[PDB]
Amino acid sequence: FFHASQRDALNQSLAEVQGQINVSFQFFPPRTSEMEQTLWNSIDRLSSLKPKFVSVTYGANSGERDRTHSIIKGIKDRTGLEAAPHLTCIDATPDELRTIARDYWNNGIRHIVALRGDLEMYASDLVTLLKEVADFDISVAAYPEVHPEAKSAQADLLNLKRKVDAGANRAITQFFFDVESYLRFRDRCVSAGIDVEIIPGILPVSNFKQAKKLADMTNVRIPAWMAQMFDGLDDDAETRKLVGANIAMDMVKILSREGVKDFHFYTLNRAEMSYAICHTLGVRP
Amino acid sequence: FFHASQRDALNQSLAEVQGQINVSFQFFPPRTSEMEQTLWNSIDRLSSLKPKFVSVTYGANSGERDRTHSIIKGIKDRTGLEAAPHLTCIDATPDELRTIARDYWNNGIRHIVALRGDLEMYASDLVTLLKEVADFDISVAAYPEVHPEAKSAQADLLNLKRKVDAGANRAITQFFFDVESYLRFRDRCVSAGIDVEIIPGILPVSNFKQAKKLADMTNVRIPAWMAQMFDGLDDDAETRKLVGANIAMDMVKILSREGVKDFHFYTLNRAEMSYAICHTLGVRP
Amino acid sequence: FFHASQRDALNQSLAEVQGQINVSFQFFPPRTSEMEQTLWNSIDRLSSLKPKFVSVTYTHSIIKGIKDRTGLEAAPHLTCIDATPDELRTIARDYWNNGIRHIVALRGDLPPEMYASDLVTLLKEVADFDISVAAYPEVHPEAKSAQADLLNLKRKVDAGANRAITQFFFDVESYLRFRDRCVSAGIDVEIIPGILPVSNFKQAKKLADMTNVRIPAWMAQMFDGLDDDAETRKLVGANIAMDMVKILSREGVKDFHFYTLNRAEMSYAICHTLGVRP
Amino acid sequence: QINVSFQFFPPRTSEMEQTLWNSIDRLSSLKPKFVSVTYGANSGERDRTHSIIKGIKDRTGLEAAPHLTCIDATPDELRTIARDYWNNGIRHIVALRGDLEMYASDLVTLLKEVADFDISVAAYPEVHPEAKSAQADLLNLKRKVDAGANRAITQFFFDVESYLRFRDRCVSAGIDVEIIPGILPVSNFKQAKKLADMTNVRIPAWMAQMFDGLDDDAETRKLVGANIAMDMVKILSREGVKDFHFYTLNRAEMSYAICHTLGVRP
Ligand SMILES: Cc1cc2nc3c(=O)[nH]c(=O)nc-3n(C[C@H](O)[C@H](O)[C@H](O)COP(=O)(O)OP(=O)(O)OC[C@H]3O[C@@H](n4cnc5c(N)ncnc54)[C@H](O)[C@@H]3O)c2cc1C
Ligand SMILES: Cc1cc2nc3c(=O)[nH]c(=O)nc-3n(C[C@H](O)[C@H](O)[C@H](O)COP(=O)(O)OP(=O)(O)OC[C@H]3O[C@@H](n4cnc5c(N)ncnc54)[C@H](O)[C@@H]3O)c2cc1C
Ligand SMILES: Cc1cc2nc3c(=O)[nH]c(=O)nc-3n(C[C@H](O)[C@H](O)[C@H](O)COP(=O)(O)OP(=O)(O)OC[C@H]3O[C@@H](n4cnc5c(N)ncnc54)[C@H](O)[C@@H]3O)c2cc1C
Ligand SMILES: Cc1cc2nc3c(=O)[nH]c(=O)nc-3n(C[C@H](O)[C@H](O)[C@H](O)COP(=O)(O)OP(=O)(O)OC[C@H]3O[C@@H](n4cnc5c(N)ncnc54)[C@H](O)[C@@H]3O)c2cc1C
Ligand SMILES: CN1c2c(nc(N)[nH]c2=O)NC[C@@H]1CNc1ccc(C(=O)N[C@@H](CCC(=O)O)C(=O)O)cc1
Ligand SMILES: CN1c2c(nc(N)[nH]c2=O)NC[C@@H]1CNc1ccc(C(=O)N[C@@H](CCC(=O)O)C(=O)O)cc1
Ligand SMILES: CN1c2c(nc(N)[nH]c2=O)NC[C@@H]1CNc1ccc(C(=O)N[C@@H](CCC(=O)O)C(=O)O)cc1
Ligand SMILES: OC[C@@H](O)[C@@H](O)CO
C-alpha cells in the first residue's frame, strides 16, 4: 500500500526534524485598536518560538511609514528579537531612503526587507543604496510563479540574481499553493548561479475569498483541488480554519522532506495557524 | 519531485469523490445538561450531511439503557434519520434481550449495533438472538489490530466471520491510527471469505491524553510520529484541534484513494472535527 | 523513491513493536561435552530475553535442567515413531506430574502407524496439556496434496493443539499464502513461523531438499561462493533472517519460534531487531 | 555491473598496521576500481598517507588514490608533490580542502595544470557544515566538477532518500559525473554517532533504536550493522547506483560481505 507507507515515512521524517528548522514571522501595522491588541498577543505567542527574525510590512504609497518604525521598535523593546522593517522605494527619493536607512541603522535595526513596492527605482536599486549606507542584512522578494510585470520568467530570475549580486543575503518567496512550482524554481535559481537559500513564504489560509483575490492579482495559482476544498465554506469560519491548517501542514511537511529548513510565515497578525504549523515542524517553546 | 506530485494526485482524487461517500456518526448519552445541549447541537449540524445512519452507545453494565433508547427516539423524531442503538449482551439475559429487541422493532428501530460489551454470551450469540426476533440490520465490531482478549488474530478474524454468518450485514472497526493495519485487515477479511464491507471507525483526536489511555487499553497502536505530534500540547487545546484535524483528514484521504466509500465517525458528541473531515470527502449540506 | 520510503516505514514500524513480540527457542540434546557447554551458555544468554517458552527436540533431563536453572516454560518434543500408544501415556503422565504442562506433539521423522493427530488426541486424554504441532507452508513431503496436508493440520488443531509451528521456510510469500489458506479452512490457532537463521548453507540446503522446503534462486546465489567463508555466511544469513522477520512483523506476526541449533548469537540478534531485549 | 572502491587510513599503531594489511589482501581480491587512503594533518601527515599508497600499489597492483588536502600547503608545494606522485605512477587523487585560503576547487585546478589526473572530490547530500546554503554547496560541487573532477564521492548518510534527492539536484544542476555514495558500515555506533553529529548527517530514529543497548555487545552490533548496510546498498542499486565507495575504517569483514551481496566476488 504505497500511499499509506509514503505517509508514515513522511510523517516520521517530519518528527525527526525537531530542532533544525528556522522560522520567521511577518506582521503588518494594525489599523484598529482591536488589531493592535491581536498583534501584540500574536507577537508574544510567536516570540516564544524563537524565530530567527520577524518583519513588518510597509504599504507603498501609503504615507504611513511611521507606523512600521514604531511597531519595529516595540517588538525589539518587548521581545529582544531581531525585527526587520520592510522598505519600499517606489514612493521615496534616494535621499529620503538614505536618511530612513541611516536612522534604522543608528536605532539598532540592521536587517531590512528591501522591496520595490505595490504600485524609477527597482528593488535592486534599493539594495545597492542600502549597502552604500551600511552593511545591512537585506532580504528580497522572489517569485516562483513569476512577478506579474516581468517581461519573462528569465528576466524575473535574472532580476533576483541582480538583487542578490547587489547585496541581498536572503530571498523570501511570494506565497504559493503549487508546491512543485517552488521546487522547480529552487532548481532554476541554482541554474542561474544564485547562491542564497530561497525561503518559502507560507500563507496559512483561513479566509479563502480574500486569499483568492490576492492570488489572482499576483499570478499565484490556486489548484483546482484547493478551490474545491474551500467551496461552500463562505460562512463557516471553523471548517475553513481546519481545512487551511491541513493544507499548510501538508505543504511544510513536503517542503521539509525536500530539504527546506527555513520558513517565513505570512501571519496576517494572527498566531494560531502559524504557531500550530511550527509545532508540526518541531518548532516549540 | 515524487512527494509533491503524489500529494497533488491524492488531493485531486479526493476532490473527485464528491457525492460518493456514505458516512455515519456515533454519539453517546449525555451525562450533563451541558453535554445534552452540545449533543443536540451536534445532531442538528451533522444531520445536514445526510448520514446513512447514526448510532448511540450503551455502556455495558451501566444500567442506564433507558438513556440510550430515549436519545434514539429523540433523533428519529427530530431528524427523520435512521438511528441505531448499541446493544450489549454481557449484562442482560437472553429473555431481557428479546424484549428489548422486540420493543425496538415495534418502535420503528430496525438497525442495531450488536456488541458483547466492555466488561456467557458473545456478540455472535446476540446477532443470532436478534435475527430470531426480527429481520434487523445488524452492525458488529471489527478489530484490525485484534481484540485484546482474542486467543489469536486468526481466532478473532474467524469470530468476525461468525458474526457475519449469523446475520451481521455491516462491520465497523475499532479506531486506528496505523492506516496500513486497516488495509491489511481488509485484505485478510477477504481471505477469510467475509463478504461485508469493513467500515473504518474514525476517531478525530483533540484530547490526546484521553485517546491514548483508551488506545492503550484496546490494543490500538499510536505511531511514534503521532505521539510526537501531540507532545507538549497538554494545555493547548487550539493546536491540538488543528493537529488532530490534520491527522484525520490525511487518514480519510488515503483510505478514500484505496477505495473506502464508507466512514463511521466517533464524534464524542462534538460536530466540528467530523463535519470538517466530511467536508474534505465532499460530504456537504 | 518508493523503495527508500517503504524501507524507512518498515524499519520504523519494527522499531515500534519493541516489547510486544513473543519468542520461543528450540534446542536439541547435545552429543558432545563441547556442545553441552555451548547449550547451557546459549540457554543462559537467551533466557534473558524472557521467551514465552523454550523446547527440546526428541531430553527429559535437559527440560528439567532448564526449568530449574531459569524457571522458563520448557516444552519437550514427543513423537509416536518410537513407542507404543500405552508407553506414550506413561511418558506423558510422567511429564505432567513434574511441572511439564506444554508438549510439542509430532509424528516423528521415520528411521531408515499412528499420526500426530492421534498423539494430540492421546496426550489430551491424559491431561489438559498445551499442545504445539507442526505446520508445513510448502506441504509435508508425504502428504498427497496441499489440501490434504492442510486438512490434517485442521485435524490436529481440532484434536486439541492450540499452537502451530511451521517448518522453516525462506519464501515469505509461501508462508503468508499458507496463513491465509489456514484461516479460510477455519483453523483458529496462530501459525507461528519457525525461523532457521542460516550460517551453514550446505547443511541447511541438504535438510531443505529432504523436507520439501524451497530455496529461492536469490538465496542460492546469495550463498554461492561462501563454502569456506564462515564470517560472510553469518552476516548474509543474519541479514536474510532479519529481513524475513521484519516483513513478517509488519504483516502482523507477533510470535516467532527460533531453530537455534543450540547457538545464541544469531537468534539473539534477530530478537534484538524485534525489540526483544534483556 | 557494480564497481566498488575502498577507503583506508594510515595506521598509527603496530596492531592497526597488521589489521590494515590483512584487510587490503582480503579486499583486493574483489578487484575494486580503486582504493584510497585518507590524510590527517595531525594523525600521520602526507608521508604516512603516501607510504600506505605506495605499499598498496606495490603489494596489489591496484589503483591507489591518496587524499590530498590544501590546508597549510602552498601552491608551489602542492605542484611539487603532485608532480612527484604522477612520476611515481599515482594517477588518481582525491582532492580535498581538508579538515582544519584555497578551496578544493582551487586544488582541482592546480592538479589539472600539473597533469591529467583522475580526480575525485567530496560531495555532501546533507550539506557541508560550513556552507552558507544548500544552494551554495551545490554550486561549489559544480565548480569542482567544472574545474576537472571526474567523480564525486559523498559523505556517508543513513537517510537513503537524502542521497537520492541530492543526486537529482546534481543532475538538475548539470553535474554530469557519477555521484558515488560513500557507505559507512557501522559496527561501533557510539563512534559512528560522533562522526555523524559532527557532519550534520542524520541518524534515523529507527537506527538509533537499533543500536540502543548494544554498547557492550560487539557481535550483535556487527550483525545489525551488516543488515543496515546490506539493505542500503540493495535499495541504492535498485535506484540505479552502480558505484559504491566503502569507508572500511581498515576493517574488511563488513565491506567484504556487503560487496558479496552486490554480486562483487573474487
Ligand atoms: C516577502 C515579500 C514581502 C513584501 N513586503 C511588501 C511591503 O512591505 N510593502 C509593499 O508595498 N509590497 C510588499 N511586497 C510586494 C512587492 O512590493 C510587489 O510584489 C512589487 O510589485 C514588486 O516588488 P519587488 O521588491 O519584488 O520588485 P522588483 O524586484 O524590482 O521586481 C519588480 C518587477 O520589476 C521587474 N524588473 C526588475 N528590474 C527591472 C528593470 N531593470 N527593467 C524592467 N523591469 C524590471 C521584475 O522582473 C519584476 O517584474 C512584498 C512581496 C514579498 C514577496
Ligand atoms: C463500533 C464499536 C461500537 C461499540 N459500542 C459499544 C457500546 O455501545 N457499549 C459497550 O459497552 N462497548 C461498545 N464497544 C466495545 C465492545 O463492546 C468491546 O470491544 C468488547 O470487549 C467486545 O465487544 P464485541 O461486540 O466485539 O465482542 P465479540 O465479538 O464477542 O468479541 C469479543 C472477544 O471475544 C472473543 N471471542 C468471540 N467468540 C468467542 C468464543 N466463542 N470463545 C472465546 N472467545 C471468543 C473475540 O475474539 C474477542 O476477543 C464498541 C466497539 C466498537 C468497535
Ligand atoms: C516445529 C517442528 C518440531 C519438530 N520436532 C521433531 C522432533 O523433536 N523429533 C522428530 O523425529 N521430528 C520432528 N519434526 C519433524 C516431523 O516429525 C516430521 O516432519 C514428520 O515427517 C512429520 O511429523 P508431523 O508431526 O508433522 O506428522 P503429520 O502431521 O501426521 O504429517 C505427516 C504426514 O502424514 C500425513 N497424514 C497425517 N495424518 C494422516 C491420515 N490420518 N491419513 C493419511 N495421511 C495422513 C500428513 O499430511 C503428512 O504428510 C519437527 C517438525 C517441526 C515443523
Ligand atoms: C569522500 C570524502 C573523503 C575525505 N577525506 C578527507 C581526508 O583524507 N582528510 C581530511 O582532512 N578531510 C577529508 N574529508 C573532509 C573534508 O576535508 C572536509 O569536509 C572539509 O571541511 C571540506 O573539504 P572539501 O574538499 O569538501 O572542501 P570544499 O569543496 O572547498 O568545501 C568546503 C566548504 O567551503 C565552501 N566553499 C567552497 N567554495 C567557497 C567559496 N568560494 N567561498 C565560501 N565558501 C566556499 C563549501 O560550500 C563548503 O561549505 C573528506 C570528505 C569526503 C566527503
Ligand atoms: C506583504 N504581502 C504582499 C504580497 N504580494 C503583494 N503584491 N503585496 C503584498 O502586500 N505577498 C506577501 C504578503 C501577503 N500579505 C497578505 C495580506 C492580507 C491577506 C488577506 O487575505 N487578508 C484578509 C483576511 C486576513 C485574515 O484571515 O486575518 C482580509 O480580510 O484582508 C493575504 C496576504
Ligand atoms: C464506543 N467506543 C468504544 C470503543 N472500544 C471500547 N473497548 N469501548 C468503547 O466504549 N471504540 C469505539 C468507541 C470509542 N469511544 C470513545 C469515547 C471517549 C473518548 C475520549 O477520549 N473522551 C475524552 C475527551 C472527549 C472529547 O475530546 O470531547 C474524555 O475526556 O473522556 C475516545 C473514544
Ligand atoms: C526439529 N527440526 C526438524 C525439522 N524437519 C524434520 N524433517 N526433522 C527435524 O528434526 N524442522 C525443524 C527442526 C530443524 N532442525 C534443524 C537441525 C540441524 C540443522 C543444520 O543444518 N545444522 C548443521 C550445522 C548446525 C550449526 O549451524 O551449528 C549440522 O549438520 O549440524 C538445521 C535445522
Ligand atoms: O572515515 C569516514 C570519513 O572519511 C568520511 O566521513 C569523510 O570525512
Side-chain angles (χ1 to χ4, degrees), chain A residues 1 3-5 7-33 35-57 59-64 66-119 121-150 152-183 185-220 222-237 239-285, chain B residues 1 3-5 7-33 35-57 59-64 66-119 121-150 152-183 185-220 222-237 239-285, chain C residues 1 4-5 7-19 21-32 34-36 38-51 53-57 59 61-63 65-66 68-80 83 85 88 92 95 98-100 102-112 114-122 126-143 145-153 155-172 174-176 178-205 207-230 232-264 266-278, chain D residues 2-14 16-32 34-70 72-100 102-164 166-189 192-193 195-218 220-233 235-237 239-241 243-250 252 254-266:
Chain A
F1 303 97
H3 296 301
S5 205
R7 167 179 190 251
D8 288 342
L10 220 44
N11 285 2
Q12 176 62 207
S13 288
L14 180 61
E16 298 184 11
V17 144
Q18 274 215 68
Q20 300 186 50
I21 303 308
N22 299 335
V23 302
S24 52
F25 303 111
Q26 180 169 127
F27 306 104
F28 64 85
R31 311 198 75 194
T32 62
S33 50
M35 177 55 70
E36 189 86 19
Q37 185 183 67
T38 294
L39 171 64
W40 293 106
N41 291 353
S42 296
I43 284 166
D44 285 344
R45 180 64 165 172
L46 298 171
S47 74
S48 74
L49 304 182
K50 298 189 180 179
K52 179 102 146 193
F53 64 92
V54 296
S55 69
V56 177
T57 60
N61 307 10
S62 70
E64 292 176 286
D66 184 46
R67 295 286 295 108
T68 296
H69 198 323
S70 171
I71 296 301
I72 288 286
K73 176 190 186 63
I75 291 171
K76 295 170 62 67
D77 289 347
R78 186 192 191 104
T79 72
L81 296 173
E82 172 171 292
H86 297 211
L87 178 61
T88 63
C89 53
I90 193 63
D91 63 345
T93 69
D95 284 340
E96 293 172 330
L97 288 166
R98 296 180 182 110
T99 299
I100 291 165
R102 252 163 22 238
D103 291 349
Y104 275 140
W105 184 270
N106 295 338
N107 283 336
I109 301 159
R110 314 199 164 169
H111 174 189
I112 293 176
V113 187
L115 305 136
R116 192 276 302 279
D118 284 335
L119 304 189
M121 295 181 70
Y122 284 94
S124 60
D125 297 306
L126 181 57
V127 179
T128 297
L129 179 155
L130 291 174
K131 297 257 77 167
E132 286 170 359
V133 173
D135 193 21
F136 288 102
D137 284 319
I138 300 175
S139 299
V140 294
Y143 305 89
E145 297 179 79
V146 190
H147 186 272
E149 287 170 9
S152 69
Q154 277 76 188
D156 206 39
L157 186 59
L158 288 173
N159 177 60
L160 178 58
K161 183 176 184 67
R162 184 169 311 121
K163 302 197 286 194
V164 169
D165 288 350
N169 58 358
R170 297 177 169 97
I172 298 168
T173 77
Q174 181 58 287
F175 61 86
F176 52 91
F177 301 106
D178 174 354
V179 172
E180 292 205 30
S181 290
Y182 165 85
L183 297 171
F185 180 73
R186 183 182 67 174
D187 278 333
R188 291 208 77 204
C189 285
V190 167
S191 298
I194 299 171
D195 69 2
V196 305
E197 222 70 290
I198 306 301
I199 302 174
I202 306 297
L203 179 65
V205 173
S206 53
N207 183 334
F208 176 81
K209 279 183 159 191
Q210 291 307 114
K212 173 179 167 45
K213 286 174 188 169
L214 186 53
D216 287 349
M217 288 183 293
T218 53
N219 200 208
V220 173
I222 294 175
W225 62 259
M226 176 173 171
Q228 188 265 12
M229 189 55 76
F230 282 99
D231 189 57
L233 298 185
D234 289 358
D235 300 313
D236 185 353
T239 302
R240 289 195 312 263
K241 177 197 294 183
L242 296 186
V243 154
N246 175 238
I247 287 165
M249 286 173 178
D250 255 313
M251 290 180 60
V252 305
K253 181 163 58 187
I254 291 172
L255 288 167
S256 171
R257 194 61 176 115
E258 298 299 325
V260 175
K261 304 186 183 307
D262 294 275
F263 298 85
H264 179 77
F265 293 90
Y266 299 119
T267 67
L268 313 182
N269 286 0
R270 301 182 195 285
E272 186 189 359
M273 302 186 60
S274 294
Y275 185 97
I277 297 158
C278 286
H279 179 85
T280 71
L281 287 161
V283 179
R284 311 177 178 183
Chain B
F1 303 97
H3 296 301
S5 205
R7 167 179 190 251
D8 288 342
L10 220 44
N11 285 2
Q12 176 62 207
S13 288
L14 180 61
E16 298 184 11
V17 144
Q18 274 215 68
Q20 300 186 50
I21 303 308
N22 299 335
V23 302
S24 52
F25 303 111
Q26 180 169 127
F27 306 104
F28 64 85
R31 311 198 75 194
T32 62
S33 50
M35 177 55 70
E36 189 86 19
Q37 185 183 67
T38 294
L39 171 64
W40 293 106
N41 291 353
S42 296
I43 284 166
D44 285 344
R45 180 64 165 172
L46 298 171
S47 74
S48 74
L49 304 182
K50 298 189 180 179
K52 179 102 146 193
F53 64 92
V54 296
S55 69
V56 177
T57 60
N61 307 10
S62 70
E64 292 176 286
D66 184 46
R67 295 286 295 108
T68 296
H69 198 323
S70 171
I71 296 301
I72 288 286
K73 176 190 186 63
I75 291 171
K76 295 170 62 67
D77 289 347
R78 186 192 191 104
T79 72
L81 296 173
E82 172 171 292
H86 297 211
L87 178 61
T88 63
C89 53
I90 193 63
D91 63 345
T93 69
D95 284 340
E96 293 172 330
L97 288 166
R98 296 180 182 110
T99 299
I100 291 165
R102 252 163 22 238
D103 291 349
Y104 275 140
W105 184 270
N106 295 338
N107 283 336
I109 301 159
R110 314 199 164 169
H111 174 189
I112 293 176
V113 187
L115 305 136
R116 192 276 302 279
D118 284 335
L119 304 189
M121 295 181 70
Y122 284 94
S124 60
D125 297 306
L126 181 57
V127 179
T128 297
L129 179 155
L130 291 174
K131 297 257 77 167
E132 286 170 359
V133 173
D135 193 21
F136 288 102
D137 284 319
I138 300 175
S139 299
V140 294
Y143 305 89
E145 297 179 79
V146 190
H147 186 272
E149 287 170 9
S152 69
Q154 277 76 188
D156 206 39
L157 186 59
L158 288 173
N159 177 60
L160 178 58
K161 183 176 184 67
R162 184 169 311 121
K163 302 197 286 194
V164 169
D165 288 350
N169 58 358
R170 297 177 169 97
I172 298 168
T173 77
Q174 181 58 287
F175 61 86
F176 52 91
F177 301 106
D178 174 354
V179 172
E180 292 205 30
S181 290
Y182 165 85
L183 297 171
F185 180 73
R186 183 182 67 174
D187 278 333
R188 291 208 77 204
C189 285
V190 167
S191 298
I194 299 171
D195 69 2
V196 305
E197 222 70 290
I198 306 301
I199 302 174
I202 306 297
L203 179 65
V205 173
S206 53
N207 183 334
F208 176 81
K209 279 183 159 191
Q210 291 307 114
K212 173 179 167 45
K213 286 174 188 169
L214 186 53
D216 287 349
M217 288 183 293
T218 53
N219 200 208
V220 173
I222 294 175
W225 62 259
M226 176 173 171
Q228 188 265 12
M229 189 55 76
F230 282 99
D231 189 57
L233 298 185
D234 289 358
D235 300 313
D236 185 353
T239 302
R240 289 195 312 263
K241 177 197 294 183
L242 296 186
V243 154
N246 175 238
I247 287 165
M249 286 173 178
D250 255 313
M251 290 180 60
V252 305
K253 181 163 58 187
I254 291 172
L255 288 167
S256 171
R257 194 61 176 115
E258 298 299 325
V260 175
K261 304 186 183 307
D262 294 275
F263 298 85
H264 179 77
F265 293 90
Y266 299 119
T267 67
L268 313 182
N269 286 0
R270 301 182 195 285
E272 186 189 359
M273 302 186 60
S274 294
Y275 185 97
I277 297 158
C278 286
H279 179 85
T280 71
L281 287 161
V283 179
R284 311 177 178 183
Chain C
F1 331 109
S5 163
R7 170 187 174 248
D8 291 332
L10 196 57
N11 285 356
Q12 177 62 213
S13 292
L14 182 65
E16 297 180 13
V17 303
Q18 177 161 197
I21 300 309
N22 292 347
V23 303
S24 49
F25 301 113
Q26 188 174 118
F27 305 106
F28 65 84
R31 311 286 277 113
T32 68
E34 175 173 339
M35 178 60 71
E36 186 76 9
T38 294
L39 173 59
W40 296 106
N41 288 351
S42 295
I43 291 175
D44 286 338
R45 170 80 158 171
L46 293 172
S47 59
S48 68
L49 303 180
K50 294 178 165 183
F53 67 91
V54 297
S55 68
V56 175
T57 61
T59 296
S61 183
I62 301 291
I63 286 288
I66 288 174
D68 297 346
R69 189 186 188 97
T70 67
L72 303 162
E73 167 177 328
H77 292 211
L78 186 57
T79 69
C80 36
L88 288 167
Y95 274 125
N98 295 18
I100 307 308
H102 182 190
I103 290 182
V104 187
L106 308 144
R107 196 279 307 280
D109 285 335
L110 306 174
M114 55 179 295
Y115 290 97
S117 63
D118 304 310
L119 180 56
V120 174
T121 289
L122 177 157
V126 177
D128 196 25
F129 278 101
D130 255 298
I131 289 86
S132 297
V133 292
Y136 304 88
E138 301 171 79
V139 190
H140 185 274
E142 289 176 14
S145 67
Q147 189 66 184
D149 200 39
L150 181 70
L151 289 174
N152 177 58
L153 175 56
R155 282 202 302 281
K156 306 203 280 178
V157 173
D158 289 345
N162 42 14
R163 290 186 205 79
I165 298 166
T166 76
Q167 182 56 286
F168 62 86
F169 57 90
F170 301 107
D171 184 339
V172 177
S174 290
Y175 166 83
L176 292 174
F178 175 75
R179 198 185 173 218
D180 288 339
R181 286 191 305 270
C182 288
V183 66
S184 304
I187 300 174
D188 68 358
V189 299
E190 176 63 86
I191 309 296
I192 303 171
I195 304 289
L196 174 67
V198 173
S199 57
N200 180 337
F201 175 80
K202 305 178 68 171
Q203 289 307 83
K205 173 177 166 51
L207 184 53
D209 291 348
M210 287 166 46
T211 53
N212 201 216
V213 173
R214 190 176 81 92
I215 297 171
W218 64 259
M219 174 172 178
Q221 190 232 46
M222 190 76 104
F223 278 103
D224 189 63
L226 300 179
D227 288 357
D228 305 310
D229 187 352
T232 301
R233 291 197 310 264
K234 184 197 297 175
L235 296 183
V236 161
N239 175 238
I240 284 158
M242 288 170 179
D243 196 48
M244 292 184 56
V245 301
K246 175 156 46 181
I247 299 173
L248 289 169
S249 177
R250 195 59 175 108
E251 293 307 313
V253 175
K254 298 184 175 307
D255 297 275
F256 299 86
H257 183 69
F258 294 88
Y259 299 121
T260 72
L261 308 184
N262 292 350
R263 308 190 189 283
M266 302 189 68
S267 294
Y268 186 98
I270 300 155
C271 282
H272 179 83
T273 70
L274 290 157
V276 179
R277 306 170 181 186
Chain D
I2 297 185
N3 304 319
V4 301
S5 48
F6 301 111
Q7 182 175 119
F8 304 103
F9 66 85
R12 313 200 69 195
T13 65
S14 201
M16 177 62 66
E17 185 88 30
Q18 182 177 62
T19 298
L20 169 64
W21 296 107
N22 293 345
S23 295
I24 287 164
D25 286 350
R26 183 67 159 153
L27 296 170
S28 71
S29 74
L30 302 181
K31 300 167 182 277
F34 64 94
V35 298
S36 70
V37 178
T38 64
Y39 162 84
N42 297 326
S43 62
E45 310 194 346
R46 280 192 306 255
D47 70 332
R48 290 288 301 155
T49 294
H50 178 265
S51 185
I52 300 303
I53 286 290
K54 179 167 194 305
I56 286 169
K57 291 172 67 60
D58 290 347
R59 183 188 191 109
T60 72
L62 292 173
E63 172 175 294
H67 296 209
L68 181 62
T69 66
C70 44
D72 294 332
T74 68
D76 287 339
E77 288 173 333
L78 292 161
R79 299 181 175 107
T80 294
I81 293 160
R83 213 137 42 215
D84 177 56
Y85 288 6
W86 180 262
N87 288 347
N88 292 343
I90 296 164
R91 313 216 178 290
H92 179 179
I93 290 170
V94 183
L96 301 148
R97 204 253 323 258
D99 288 337
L100 213 205
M102 295 172 70
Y103 288 94
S105 59
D106 295 306
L107 177 60
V108 175
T109 295
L110 178 160
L111 290 173
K112 294 260 75 169
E113 291 179 351
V114 172
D116 191 23
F117 286 101
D118 198 359
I119 297 169
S120 292
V121 293
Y124 304 90
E126 298 172 84
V127 190
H128 187 272
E130 301 171 352
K132 82 167 161 188
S133 69
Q135 306 282 78
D137 209 37
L138 189 60
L139 290 165
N140 177 59
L141 178 58
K142 188 175 184 65
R143 280 200 295 281
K144 294 198 288 190
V145 170
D146 290 346
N150 49 20
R151 185 163 313 97
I153 300 172
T154 77
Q155 179 60 283
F156 60 87
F157 51 88
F158 292 104
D159 176 357
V160 173
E161 259 202 45
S162 177
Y163 165 85
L164 294 170
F166 178 76
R167 185 182 64 177
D168 283 347
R169 300 212 66 198
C170 287
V171 170
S172 294
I175 301 175
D176 294 327
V177 302
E178 285 305 317
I179 310 303
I180 304 175
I183 303 294
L184 179 69
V186 172
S187 59
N188 189 304
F189 179 76
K193 179 178 196 313
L195 299 174
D197 290 346
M198 305 197 304
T199 51
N200 300 346
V201 169
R202 169 181 309 192
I203 298 176
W206 60 257
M207 178 174 169
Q209 187 262 24
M210 185 59 72
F211 282 99
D212 186 70
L214 301 184
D215 290 340
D216 302 318
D217 187 353
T220 300
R221 293 198 310 265
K222 190 196 300 177
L223 297 185
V224 157
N227 176 235
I228 291 173
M230 289 171 178
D231 224 41
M232 291 180 54
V233 302
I235 293 186
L236 288 164
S237 172
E239 301 297 346
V241 173
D243 299 272
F244 298 87
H245 181 77
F246 293 90
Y247 298 124
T248 69
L249 301 179
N250 288 356
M254 299 187 65
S255 290
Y256 186 97
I258 300 160
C259 285
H260 184 88
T261 71
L262 291 166
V264 177
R265 305 171 185 185

